[PDB]
């Protein structure tokens, strides 16, 4: 299996330049980039009043790349002297065939708000940032929400200390937090 981590937060609009500049020159080789996603958050339930993790939000960037969703729900207990932790998974599917089977299986949507932003290549970990946009199909907290998204099997879970050290380094305008 795998695990899931998060360092959720927010920051003002005016205070992004120094933040992204600091975050950039940490472990990135060169040529920072960005990406605009596409919101297709769905829901797969109707039999036990307990919905599944059907947030099938996949980027609307250059084609060829296959769409997919990750498992994010039901935060499990544990993580003694550690940060947020929950069993996660991943499964890639054919282009546009995933939504086809989702609609054929009789599922509903969950949200239609898209959150584009930037990405940043960390080291043994990974970080991401985005801002919620309330827009139509082809085109809102008004704050760039950031977090430390990283997936890995059980292993040693020593990465929690590294994430805490990074959060300590990322002191000024961001911190870590769990969700329930």
């Amino acid at each position: 299996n795998m695990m899931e981590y998060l360092l959720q937060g927010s920051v003002l609009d005016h205070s992004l330049e120094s933040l992204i500049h600091r975050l950039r020159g940490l472990c990135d080789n060169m040529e920072p980039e960005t990406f605009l996603d596409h919101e297709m958050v769905f829901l797969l339930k109707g039999q036990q009043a307990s919905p599944f993790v059907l947030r099938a939000r996949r980027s609307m960037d250059r084609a060829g790349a296959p769409w997919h969703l990750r498992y994010l729900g039901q935060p499990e207990m544990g993580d003694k002297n550690r940060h947020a932790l929950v069993r996660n998974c991943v499964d890639i599917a054919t282009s546009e065939n995933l939504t086809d089977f989702l609609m054929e299986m009789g599922f509903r949507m969950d949200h239609e708000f898209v959150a584009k932003g930037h990405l940043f290549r960390k080291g043994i970990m990974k970080i991401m940032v985005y801002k919620i946009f309330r827009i139509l199909v082809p085109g809102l907290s008004l704050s760039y929400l950031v977090e430390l998204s990283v997936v890995a099997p059980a292993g040693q879970d020593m990465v929690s200390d590294d994430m805490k050290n990074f959060a300590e380094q990322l002191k000024p305008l961001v911190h870590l937090e769990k969700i329930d």
Partner: peptide
Amino acid sequence: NKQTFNPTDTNALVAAVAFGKGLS
């Protein structure tokens, strides 16, 4: 003494991202 972090934005964004708690 310019403020660089918004505490209200942090708590509000976390609750509106998990589900629709506060939308309806």
